[PDB]
Protein backbone atom coordinates (compact mmCIF):
# COMPACT_ATOMS: atom_id res chain seq x y z
CA UNK A 1 0.00 0.00 0.00
CA UNK A 2 2.48 2.61 1.21
CA UNK A 3 5.91 3.33 -0.26
CA UNK A 4 9.11 4.87 1.10
CA UNK A 5 11.10 7.02 -1.33
CA UNK A 6 14.56 8.35 -0.46
CA UNK A 7 15.24 11.10 -3.01
CA UNK A 8 19.02 11.56 -3.17
CA UNK A 9 20.30 14.60 -5.07
CA UNK A 10 23.57 16.20 -6.13
CA UNK A 11 24.45 19.76 -5.11
CA UNK A 12 28.01 19.75 -6.41
CA UNK A 13 29.81 22.52 -8.25
CA UNK A 14 30.02 20.51 -11.49
CA UNK A 15 26.28 21.03 -12.01
CA UNK A 16 26.37 24.83 -11.81
CA UNK A 17 29.14 25.15 -14.42
CA UNK A 18 27.45 24.43 -17.75
CA UNK A 19 26.34 26.13 -20.95
CA UNK A 20 23.50 28.58 -20.15
CA UNK A 21 21.44 27.32 -23.09
CA UNK A 22 21.73 23.70 -21.93
CA UNK A 23 19.74 24.56 -18.77
CA UNK A 24 22.38 23.16 -16.42
CA UNK A 25 21.23 19.98 -14.66
CA UNK A 26 20.73 21.65 -11.27
CA UNK A 27 17.65 23.56 -12.42
CA UNK A 28 16.18 20.58 -14.28
CA UNK A 29 16.68 18.27 -11.30
CA UNK A 30 15.10 20.89 -9.05
CA UNK A 31 12.09 21.12 -11.37
CA UNK A 32 11.72 17.33 -11.46
CA UNK A 33 11.92 17.19 -7.66
CA UNK A 34 9.27 19.90 -7.33
CA UNK A 35 6.92 18.28 -9.84
CA UNK A 36 7.17 14.90 -8.12
CA UNK A 37 6.49 16.56 -4.77
CA UNK A 38 3.34 18.27 -6.07
CA UNK A 39 2.12 15.04 -7.65
CA UNK A 40 2.57 13.20 -4.35
CA UNK A 41 1.02 16.03 -2.30
CA UNK A 42 -2.14 16.37 -4.38
CA UNK A 43 -2.49 12.57 -4.70
CA UNK A 44 -3.03 11.38 -1.11
CA UNK A 45 -1.67 7.85 -1.49
CA UNK A 46 -0.11 7.78 2.01
CA UNK A 47 3.48 7.69 0.75
CA UNK A 48 6.58 8.67 2.72
CA UNK A 49 9.42 10.63 1.10
CA UNK A 50 12.77 11.76 2.51
CA UNK A 51 15.45 14.00 1.02
CA UNK A 52 19.23 13.48 0.98
CA UNK A 53 21.88 15.70 -0.61
CA UNK A 54 25.53 15.05 -1.40
CA UNK A 55 28.26 17.49 -2.38
CA UNK A 56 27.20 20.13 0.15
CA UNK A 57 29.51 22.00 2.52
CA UNK A 58 27.88 20.73 5.71
CA UNK A 59 27.81 17.20 7.10
CA UNK A 60 24.88 15.60 8.93
CA UNK A 61 24.59 11.82 8.60
CA UNK A 62 23.96 8.98 11.06
CA UNK A 63 27.39 7.59 10.10
CA UNK A 64 30.49 9.81 10.01
CA UNK A 65 33.60 7.67 10.46
CA UNK A 66 36.68 9.30 8.99
CA UNK A 67 37.17 11.16 5.72
CA UNK A 68 34.51 8.91 4.18
CA UNK A 69 30.81 9.76 4.43
CA UNK A 70 31.49 13.51 4.29
CA UNK A 71 29.78 16.41 2.52
CA UNK A 72 26.45 14.57 2.79
CA UNK A 73 23.26 15.72 4.52
CA UNK A 74 19.85 14.23 5.31
CA UNK A 75 17.57 17.24 4.93
CA UNK A 76 14.23 15.45 5.40
CA UNK A 77 13.32 12.24 7.21
CA UNK A 78 10.61 9.66 6.49
CA UNK A 79 7.40 11.69 6.75
CA UNK A 80 4.37 12.59 4.68
CA UNK A 81 4.90 15.24 1.98
CA UNK A 82 3.74 18.77 2.75
CA UNK A 83 3.96 22.29 1.36
CA UNK A 84 6.82 23.00 3.78
CA UNK A 85 8.94 20.59 1.73
CA UNK A 86 8.04 22.50 -1.44
CA UNK A 87 9.00 25.81 0.18
CA UNK A 88 12.29 24.32 1.38
CA UNK A 89 13.05 22.98 -2.10
CA UNK A 90 12.26 26.30 -3.76
CA UNK A 91 14.68 28.47 -1.78
CA UNK A 92 16.29 26.67 1.18
CA UNK A 93 18.35 24.49 -1.21
CA UNK A 94 21.23 26.19 -3.02
CA UNK A 95 24.23 24.86 -4.96
CA UNK A 96 27.42 24.15 -3.04
CA UNK A 97 31.10 24.03 -3.90
CA UNK A 98 32.31 20.58 -2.73
CA UNK A 99 32.29 17.09 -4.23
CA UNK A 100 31.20 13.72 -2.87
CA UNK A 101 31.26 10.05 -3.87
CA UNK A 102 27.79 8.95 -4.94
CA UNK A 103 28.55 5.44 -3.65
CA UNK A 104 28.81 6.89 -0.14
CA UNK A 105 25.56 8.75 -0.81
CA UNK A 106 23.93 5.45 -1.78
CA UNK A 107 25.27 3.92 1.44
CA UNK A 108 23.72 6.79 3.43
CA UNK A 109 20.44 6.34 1.56
CA UNK A 110 20.46 2.64 2.45
CA UNK A 111 21.21 3.50 6.08
CA UNK A 112 18.35 5.99 6.36
CA UNK A 113 15.82 3.83 4.51
CA UNK A 114 16.76 0.88 6.74
CA UNK A 115 16.80 2.77 10.06
CA UNK A 116 13.72 4.98 9.62
CA UNK A 117 11.53 2.20 8.15
CA UNK A 118 11.13 0.33 11.46
CA UNK A 119 7.63 0.29 12.93
CA UNK A 120 5.88 0.89 9.59
CA UNK A 121 4.74 -1.40 6.77
CA UNK A 122 6.01 -0.60 3.27
CA UNK A 123 5.22 -2.79 0.27
CA UNK A 124 7.73 -0.86 -1.87
CA UNK A 125 11.00 1.02 -1.45
CA UNK A 126 12.77 3.24 -3.97
CA UNK A 127 15.94 5.33 -4.21
CA UNK A 128 16.35 7.93 -6.98
CA UNK A 129 19.82 9.32 -7.72
CA UNK A 130 20.13 12.76 -9.34
CA UNK A 131 23.72 13.25 -10.51
CA UNK A 132 25.72 14.20 -13.59
CA UNK A 133 28.44 11.57 -12.94
CA UNK A 134 31.14 14.24 -13.23
CA UNK A 135 32.90 13.66 -9.89
CA UNK A 136 36.00 11.52 -9.37
CA UNK A 137 35.33 8.38 -7.35
CA UNK A 138 36.76 4.96 -6.51
CA UNK A 139 34.96 1.62 -6.91
CA UNK A 140 35.77 -0.54 -3.88
CA UNK A 141 32.44 -1.38 -2.16
CA UNK A 142 30.11 -2.38 -5.00
CA UNK A 143 29.62 -6.06 -4.14
CA UNK A 144 28.38 -5.35 -0.61
CA UNK A 145 26.05 -2.63 -1.92
CA UNK A 146 24.51 -5.00 -4.47
CA UNK A 147 24.16 -7.72 -1.83
CA UNK A 148 22.42 -5.34 0.58
CA UNK A 149 20.07 -4.05 -2.13
CA UNK A 150 19.19 -7.62 -3.14
CA UNK A 151 18.57 -8.68 0.46
CA UNK A 152 16.43 -5.64 1.32
CA UNK A 153 14.56 -5.68 -2.02
CA UNK A 154 14.99 -1.96 -2.74
CA UNK A 155 14.67 -0.66 -6.29
CA UNK A 156 17.03 1.87 -7.86
CA UNK A 157 16.68 4.64 -10.43
CA UNK A 158 18.99 7.16 -12.08
CA UNK A 159 18.36 10.54 -13.71
CA UNK A 160 21.15 12.02 -15.82
CA UNK A 161 21.38 15.14 -18.02
CA UNK A 162 21.81 12.97 -21.14
CA UNK A 163 19.41 10.47 -22.68
CA UNK A 164 22.04 7.93 -23.73
CA UNK A 165 22.29 5.12 -21.18
CA UNK A 166 29.97 14.88 -26.23
CA UNK A 167 30.85 13.75 -22.71
CA UNK A 168 34.04 13.54 -20.68
CA UNK A 169 35.90 10.35 -19.79
CA UNK A 170 34.77 10.61 -16.16
CA UNK A 171 31.16 10.78 -17.35
CA UNK A 172 31.76 7.66 -19.46
CA UNK A 173 33.17 5.81 -16.45
CA UNK A 174 30.14 6.88 -14.43
CA UNK A 175 27.93 5.53 -17.21
CA UNK A 176 29.77 2.20 -17.19
CA UNK A 177 29.53 1.81 -13.42
CA UNK A 178 25.84 2.75 -13.27
CA UNK A 179 25.09 0.39 -16.16
CA UNK A 180 26.89 -2.44 -14.36
CA UNK A 181 24.99 -1.71 -11.14
CA UNK A 182 21.66 -1.70 -12.98
CA UNK A 183 22.49 -4.91 -14.87
CA UNK A 184 23.49 -6.73 -11.68
CA UNK A 185 20.35 -5.65 -9.81
CA UNK A 186 17.81 -6.60 -12.51
CA UNK A 187 19.51 -7.31 -15.84
CA UNK A 188 18.64 -6.36 -19.41
CA UNK A 189 15.31 -4.80 -18.42
CA UNK A 190 17.15 -2.46 -16.04
CA UNK A 191 19.02 -0.69 -18.84
CA UNK A 192 15.93 1.32 -19.80
CA UNK A 193 15.39 2.37 -16.16
CA UNK A 194 17.93 5.22 -16.53
CA UNK A 195 15.83 8.27 -17.38
CA UNK A 196 16.77 11.80 -18.43
CA UNK A 197 15.70 15.09 -16.90
CA UNK A 198 13.82 16.32 -19.98
CA UNK A 199 12.04 12.99 -20.51
CA UNK A 200 11.04 12.80 -16.84
CA UNK A 201 9.72 16.37 -16.98
CA UNK A 202 7.69 15.36 -20.04
CA UNK A 203 5.93 12.71 -17.93
CA UNK A 204 5.66 14.57 -14.59
CA UNK A 205 3.91 17.67 -15.98
CA UNK A 206 0.42 16.19 -15.39
CA UNK A 207 -1.18 15.69 -11.99
CA UNK A 208 -1.98 12.10 -11.08
CA UNK A 209 -5.45 10.86 -11.98
CA UNK A 210 -8.18 10.33 -9.39
CA UNK A 211 -8.02 6.60 -8.63
CA UNK A 212 -10.81 4.82 -6.74
CA UNK A 213 -10.96 1.12 -5.88
CA UNK A 214 -14.24 -0.62 -6.66
CA UNK A 215 -15.63 -3.05 -4.09
CA UNK A 216 -16.63 -6.47 -5.39
CA UNK A 217 -20.36 -7.23 -5.50
CA UNK A 218 -21.10 -10.95 -5.04
CA UNK A 219 -24.28 -12.53 -6.36
CA UNK A 220 -25.65 -15.51 -8.30
CA UNK A 221 -26.51 -15.52 -11.99
CA UNK A 222 -29.67 -17.64 -12.16
CA UNK A 223 -31.21 -19.37 -15.18
CA UNK A 224 -34.46 -20.74 -13.81
CA UNK A 225 -34.92 -22.09 -10.30
CA UNK A 226 -32.26 -24.83 -10.54
CA UNK A 227 -29.18 -23.30 -12.23
CA UNK A 228 -27.07 -20.76 -10.34
CA UNK A 229 -23.51 -19.56 -10.94
CA UNK A 230 -21.61 -17.59 -8.31
CA UNK A 231 -20.42 -14.29 -9.80
CA UNK A 232 -18.66 -11.10 -8.71
CA UNK A 233 -19.43 -7.73 -10.31
CA UNK A 234 -17.24 -4.63 -10.43
CA UNK A 235 -17.83 -1.11 -11.75
CA UNK A 236 -15.74 -0.66 -14.90
CA UNK A 237 -16.62 2.82 -16.22
CA UNK A 238 -18.32 5.67 -14.37
CA UNK A 239 -18.21 9.45 -14.21
CA UNK A 240 -15.49 10.60 -11.82
CA UNK A 241 -16.07 13.33 -9.24
CA UNK A 242 -13.75 15.23 -6.91
CA UNK A 243 -13.17 13.31 -3.69
CA UNK A 244 -13.19 16.50 -1.58
CA UNK A 245 -15.68 19.37 -1.63
CA UNK A 246 -15.32 23.04 -0.81
CA UNK A 247 -15.93 24.10 2.80
CA UNK A 248 -17.71 27.35 3.65
CA UNK A 249 -15.74 29.49 6.11
CA UNK A 250 -16.27 32.99 7.46
CA UNK A 251 -14.43 35.68 5.53
CA UNK A 252 -12.61 37.21 8.50
CA UNK A 253 -11.48 34.45 10.87
CA UNK A 254 -11.58 31.67 8.24
CA UNK A 255 -13.10 28.94 10.41
CA UNK A 256 -15.79 26.37 9.67
CA UNK A 257 -17.16 26.29 13.23
CA UNK A 258 -18.19 29.98 13.09
CA UNK A 259 -20.87 29.40 10.41
CA UNK A 260 -23.99 27.27 10.81
CA UNK A 261 -26.70 26.15 8.38
CA UNK A 262 -30.29 25.19 9.18
CA UNK A 263 -33.75 25.17 7.63
CA UNK A 264 -37.21 26.12 8.90
CA UNK A 265 -40.78 26.11 7.58
CA UNK A 266 -43.63 28.62 7.52
CA UNK A 267 -47.22 29.02 6.31
CA UNK A 268 -48.93 31.33 3.82
CA UNK A 269 -50.48 33.49 6.55
CA UNK A 270 -49.37 37.12 6.74
CA UNK A 271 -48.09 36.49 10.28
CA UNK A 272 -45.42 34.16 8.83
CA UNK A 273 -45.84 31.57 11.57
CA UNK A 274 -43.39 28.69 12.02
CA UNK A 275 -43.94 24.94 12.31
CA UNK A 276 -41.75 22.10 13.54
CA UNK A 277 -40.35 19.30 11.40
CA UNK A 278 -42.40 16.53 13.03
CA UNK A 279 -45.58 18.47 12.16
CA UNK A 280 -44.90 18.13 8.41
CA UNK A 281 -46.06 15.25 6.19
CA UNK A 282 -45.17 14.55 2.57
CA UNK A 283 -47.81 14.57 -0.14
CA UNK A 284 -48.14 14.39 -3.90
CA UNK A 285 -50.08 16.16 -6.65
CA UNK A 286 -52.99 14.43 -8.40
CA UNK A 287 -54.14 16.78 -11.15
CA UNK A 288 -55.45 20.02 -9.65
CA UNK A 289 -55.44 18.80 -6.02
CA UNK A 290 -53.00 17.49 -3.40
CA UNK A 291 -53.32 13.95 -2.02
CA UNK A 292 -51.65 13.50 1.40
CA UNK A 293 -49.38 10.46 1.56
CA UNK A 294 -47.58 9.86 4.85
CA UNK A 295 -44.14 8.26 4.82
CA UNK A 296 -45.33 5.33 6.95
CA UNK A 297 -48.21 4.71 4.54
CA UNK A 298 -45.79 4.89 1.61
CA UNK A 299 -43.56 2.29 3.25
CA UNK A 300 -46.59 0.08 3.90
CA UNK A 301 -47.71 0.32 0.26
CA UNK A 302 -44.20 0.50 -1.21
CA UNK A 303 -43.21 -1.95 -3.93
CA UNK A 304 -41.36 -4.67 -2.02
CA UNK A 305 -38.77 -6.88 -3.73
CA UNK A 306 -35.94 -9.23 -2.80
CA UNK A 307 -32.50 -7.68 -3.09
CA UNK A 308 -29.30 -8.95 -4.67
CA UNK A 309 -30.92 -10.58 -7.69
CA UNK A 310 -29.12 -11.26 -10.99
CA UNK A 311 -31.69 -13.27 -12.94
CA UNK A 312 -31.65 -14.07 -16.66
CA UNK A 313 -35.07 -13.06 -17.98
CA UNK A 314 -34.17 -14.27 -21.46
CA UNK A 315 -31.81 -14.39 -24.41
CA UNK A 316 -32.15 -12.16 -27.48
CA UNK A 317 -30.18 -11.46 -30.64
CA UNK A 318 -27.55 -8.74 -30.36
CA UNK A 319 -29.03 -6.81 -33.28
CA UNK A 320 -32.23 -6.29 -31.25
CA UNK A 321 -30.37 -4.27 -28.57
CA UNK A 322 -29.16 -0.88 -29.80
CA UNK A 323 -26.43 1.20 -28.19
CA UNK A 324 -28.55 4.37 -28.30
CA UNK A 325 -30.99 2.85 -25.76
CA UNK A 326 -28.40 2.27 -23.02
CA UNK A 327 -29.33 3.80 -19.66
CA UNK A 328 -27.68 4.27 -16.28
CA UNK A 329 -24.47 5.96 -15.20
CA UNK A 330 -22.30 2.84 -14.86
CA UNK A 331 -21.09 -0.27 -16.66
CA UNK A 332 -20.71 -3.53 -14.74
CA UNK A 333 -18.11 -6.24 -15.36
CA UNK A 334 -19.13 -9.70 -14.14
CA UNK A 335 -16.49 -12.38 -13.49
CA UNK A 336 -16.69 -15.78 -11.86
CA UNK A 337 -16.45 -16.00 -8.08
CA UNK A 338 -12.90 -15.68 -6.80
CA UNK A 339 -11.19 -19.03 -6.14
CA UNK A 340 -14.10 -20.92 -7.73
CA UNK A 341 -13.21 -23.23 -10.62
CA UNK A 342 -16.72 -24.58 -11.23
CA UNK A 343 -18.16 -21.06 -11.44
CA UNK A 344 -15.37 -20.09 -13.84
CA UNK A 345 -16.15 -23.07 -16.08
CA UNK A 346 -19.89 -22.34 -16.07
CA UNK A 347 -19.39 -18.64 -16.84
CA UNK A 348 -16.92 -19.49 -19.61
CA UNK A 349 -19.43 -21.90 -21.14
CA UNK A 350 -22.18 -19.27 -21.04
CA UNK A 351 -19.91 -16.58 -22.52
CA UNK A 352 -18.72 -18.86 -25.32
CA UNK A 353 -22.27 -19.96 -26.14
CA UNK A 354 -23.48 -16.36 -26.30
CA UNK A 355 -20.53 -15.31 -28.47
CA UNK A 356 -20.98 -18.25 -30.86
CA UNK A 357 -24.73 -17.69 -31.21
CA UNK A 358 -24.42 -13.87 -31.30
CA UNK A 359 -26.82 -13.42 -28.39
CA UNK A 360 -27.14 -11.28 -25.26
CA UNK A 361 -28.93 -11.90 -21.97
CA UNK A 362 -31.78 -9.64 -20.89
CA UNK A 363 -31.55 -9.76 -17.10
CA UNK A 364 -33.05 -8.24 -13.95
CA UNK A 365 -30.57 -6.52 -11.63
CA UNK A 366 -31.05 -5.16 -8.11
CA UNK A 367 -28.17 -3.89 -5.98
CA UNK A 368 -29.85 -4.59 -2.63
CA UNK A 369 -33.23 -4.64 -0.89
CA UNK A 370 -33.75 -0.87 -1.09
CA UNK A 371 -32.49 -0.53 -4.69
CA UNK A 372 -34.99 -0.09 -7.50
CA UNK A 373 -34.95 -3.12 -9.84
CA UNK A 374 -33.58 -2.60 -13.33
CA UNK A 375 -33.78 -4.40 -16.67
CA UNK A 376 -30.42 -4.60 -18.42
CA UNK A 377 -28.40 -6.36 -21.10
CA UNK A 378 -25.38 -8.57 -20.41
CA UNK A 379 -23.15 -9.34 -23.38
CA UNK A 380 -19.92 -11.34 -23.65
CA UNK A 381 -16.46 -9.82 -23.73
CA UNK A 382 -13.70 -12.28 -24.65
CA UNK A 383 -10.01 -11.34 -24.52
CA UNK A 384 -6.83 -13.40 -24.62
CA UNK A 385 -6.00 -12.55 -21.00
CA UNK A 386 -9.54 -12.63 -19.56
CA UNK A 387 -13.20 -13.14 -20.42
CA UNK A 388 -16.19 -11.64 -18.63
CA UNK A 389 -19.74 -10.40 -19.03
CA UNK A 390 -20.51 -6.70 -19.51
CA UNK A 391 -23.80 -5.41 -18.09
CA UNK A 392 -25.45 -2.13 -19.11
CA UNK A 393 -28.90 -0.89 -18.13
CA UNK A 394 -31.81 -0.76 -20.57
CA UNK A 395 -34.81 1.58 -20.78
CA UNK A 396 -38.33 1.06 -19.49
CA UNK A 397 -41.52 2.02 -21.32
CA UNK A 398 -41.69 5.38 -19.53
CA UNK A 399 -38.13 6.34 -20.53
CA UNK A 400 -38.78 6.31 -24.30
CA UNK A 401 -39.58 9.61 -26.03
CA UNK A 402 -41.68 9.67 -29.22
CA UNK A 403 -40.43 12.67 -31.20
CA UNK A 404 -41.15 13.26 -34.89
CA UNK A 405 -38.45 14.73 -37.14
CA UNK A 406 -38.72 15.69 -40.80
CA UNK A 407 -36.87 13.65 -43.39
CA UNK A 408 -33.68 15.12 -44.86
CA UNK A 409 -33.27 12.93 -47.96
CA UNK A 410 -36.72 13.79 -49.34
CA UNK A 411 -36.30 17.55 -48.88
CA UNK A 412 -36.15 19.56 -52.10
CA UNK A 413 -34.60 22.74 -50.66
CA UNK A 414 -32.02 21.06 -48.37
CA UNK A 415 -30.58 18.66 -50.96
CA UNK A 416 -26.81 19.17 -51.42
CA UNK A 417 -25.33 19.29 -54.90
CA UNK A 418 -22.58 17.07 -56.32
CA UNK A 419 -19.88 19.69 -55.73
CA UNK A 420 -20.95 20.10 -52.10
CA UNK A 421 -20.81 16.33 -51.58
CA UNK A 422 -17.33 16.22 -53.13
CA UNK A 423 -16.16 19.02 -50.84
CA UNK A 424 -17.53 17.25 -47.76
CA UNK A 425 -15.87 14.01 -48.87
CA UNK A 426 -12.55 15.81 -49.24
CA UNK A 427 -12.97 17.35 -45.79
CA UNK A 428 -13.71 13.97 -44.21
CA UNK A 429 -10.72 12.38 -45.95
CA UNK A 430 -8.39 15.19 -44.87
CA UNK A 431 -9.44 15.23 -41.19
CA UNK A 432 -9.13 11.49 -40.57
CA UNK A 433 -8.01 10.66 -37.03
CA UNK A 434 -7.08 7.03 -37.81
CA UNK A 435 -4.19 5.93 -40.02
CA UNK A 436 -3.64 2.54 -41.62
CA UNK A 437 -0.33 0.87 -40.77
CA UNK A 438 0.98 1.07 -44.33
CA UNK A 439 -2.22 -0.71 -45.40
CA UNK A 440 -0.73 -3.84 -43.82
CA UNK A 441 -2.17 -4.92 -40.45
CA UNK A 442 -4.66 -2.60 -38.72
CA UNK A 443 -5.56 1.00 -37.82
CA UNK A 444 -3.77 3.36 -35.43
CA UNK A 445 -5.57 6.09 -33.48
CA UNK A 446 -3.79 9.43 -33.79
CA UNK A 447 -5.92 11.17 -31.13
CA UNK A 448 -6.95 8.62 -28.48
CA UNK A 449 -9.36 10.35 -26.10
CA UNK A 450 -9.31 7.57 -23.48
CA UNK A 451 -5.75 8.42 -22.34
CA UNK A 452 -6.37 12.16 -21.79
CA UNK A 453 -6.72 13.08 -18.09
CA UNK A 454 -9.77 15.15 -17.22
CA UNK A 455 -8.71 18.83 -17.52
CA UNK A 456 -11.07 19.79 -14.68
CA UNK A 457 -9.01 18.15 -11.94
CA UNK A 458 -5.78 19.41 -13.51
CA UNK A 459 -7.08 22.98 -13.41
CA UNK A 460 -8.36 22.58 -9.85
CA UNK A 461 -5.04 21.24 -8.57
CA UNK A 462 -3.08 23.89 -10.48
CA UNK A 463 -5.13 26.69 -8.95
CA UNK A 464 -4.94 25.19 -5.46
CA UNK A 465 -1.14 24.89 -5.70
CA UNK A 466 -0.80 28.43 -7.05
CA UNK A 467 -2.91 29.79 -4.19
CA UNK A 468 -0.95 27.78 -1.61
CA UNK A 469 2.42 29.05 -2.84
CA UNK A 470 1.21 32.58 -3.71
CA UNK A 471 -1.59 33.63 -1.34
CA UNK A 472 -1.77 37.15 -2.82
CA UNK A 473 -1.53 36.72 -6.59
CA UNK A 474 -4.66 35.92 -8.63
CA UNK A 475 -5.25 32.59 -10.30
CA UNK A 476 -3.16 32.01 -13.44
CA UNK A 477 -4.30 31.17 -16.98
CA UNK A 478 -4.89 27.63 -18.18
CA UNK A 479 -1.62 25.83 -18.85
CA UNK A 480 -0.62 25.42 -22.49
CA UNK A 481 -0.10 21.66 -22.28
CA UNK A 482 -3.76 21.21 -21.27
CA UNK A 483 -4.83 22.96 -24.47
CA UNK A 484 -2.31 20.93 -26.46
CA UNK A 485 -3.68 17.64 -25.10
CA UNK A 486 -7.28 18.83 -25.65
CA UNK A 487 -6.59 19.55 -29.34
CA UNK A 488 -5.64 17.26 -32.24
CA UNK A 489 -2.17 17.21 -33.81
CA UNK A 490 -1.29 20.17 -36.01
CA UNK A 491 -1.02 17.83 -39.01
CA UNK A 492 -4.81 17.45 -39.09
CA UNK A 493 -5.34 21.21 -39.24
CA UNK A 494 -2.57 21.61 -41.82
CA UNK A 495 -4.26 19.03 -44.04
CA UNK A 496 -7.76 20.45 -43.47
CA UNK A 497 -6.91 24.12 -44.10
CA UNK A 498 -7.81 23.98 -47.81
CA UNK A 499 -10.91 21.72 -47.71
CA UNK A 500 -12.40 24.05 -45.09
CA UNK A 501 -11.86 27.00 -47.43
CA UNK A 502 -13.56 25.09 -50.25
CA UNK A 503 -16.51 24.26 -47.99
CA UNK A 504 -16.78 27.91 -46.96
CA UNK A 505 -16.82 28.91 -50.63
CA UNK A 506 -19.45 26.32 -51.60
CA UNK A 507 -21.82 26.63 -48.61
CA UNK A 508 -23.64 30.00 -48.20
CA UNK A 509 -24.03 30.19 -44.42
CA UNK A 510 -25.69 33.40 -43.20
CA UNK A 511 -26.39 34.34 -39.58
CA UNK A 512 -29.99 35.44 -39.02
Amino acid sequence: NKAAVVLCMDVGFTMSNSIPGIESPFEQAKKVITMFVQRQVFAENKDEIALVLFGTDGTDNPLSGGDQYQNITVHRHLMLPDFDLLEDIESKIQPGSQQADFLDALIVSMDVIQHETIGKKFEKRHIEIFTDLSSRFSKSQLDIIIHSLKKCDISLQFFLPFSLGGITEQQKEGLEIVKMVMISLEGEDGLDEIYSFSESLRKLCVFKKIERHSIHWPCRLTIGSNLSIRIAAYKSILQERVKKTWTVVDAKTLKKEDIQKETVYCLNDDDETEVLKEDIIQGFRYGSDIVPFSKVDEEQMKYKSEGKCFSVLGFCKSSQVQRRFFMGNQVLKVFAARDDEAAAVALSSLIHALDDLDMVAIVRYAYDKRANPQVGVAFPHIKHNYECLVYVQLPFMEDLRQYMFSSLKNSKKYAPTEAQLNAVDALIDSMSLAKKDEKTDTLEDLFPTTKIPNPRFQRLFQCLLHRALHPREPLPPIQQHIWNMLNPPAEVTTKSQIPLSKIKTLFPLIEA
Binding site: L313, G314, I362, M397, L400, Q402
Partner: peptide
Amino acid sequence: CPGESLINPGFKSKKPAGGVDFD
Protein backbone atom coordinates in the same frame (compact mmCIF):
# COMPACT_ATOMS: atom_id res chain seq x y z
CA CYS B 1 -52.19 9.93 -38.95
CA PRO B 2 -52.04 6.14 -38.51
CA GLY B 3 -50.98 4.87 -35.11
CA GLU B 4 -51.94 8.05 -33.24
CA SER B 5 -53.21 7.90 -29.67
CA LEU B 6 -56.75 9.16 -29.14
CA ILE B 7 -56.16 10.14 -25.50
CA ASN B 8 -53.05 12.23 -26.28
CA PRO B 9 -53.09 13.67 -29.82
CA GLY B 10 -49.68 14.24 -31.36
CA PHE B 11 -48.11 11.20 -29.66
CA LYS B 12 -48.08 7.78 -31.30
CA SER B 13 -49.92 5.14 -29.28
CA LYS B 14 -47.62 2.86 -27.30
CA LYS B 15 -48.19 -0.88 -27.60
CA PRO B 16 -48.92 -2.57 -24.25
CA ALA B 17 -45.88 -4.20 -22.67
CA GLY B 18 -46.08 -7.97 -23.08
CA GLY B 19 -42.95 -8.86 -21.14
CA VAL B 20 -41.19 -12.06 -22.19
CA ASP B 21 -42.84 -14.47 -24.65
CA PHE B 22 -40.70 -17.48 -25.52
CA ASP B 23 -40.79 -18.52 -29.17
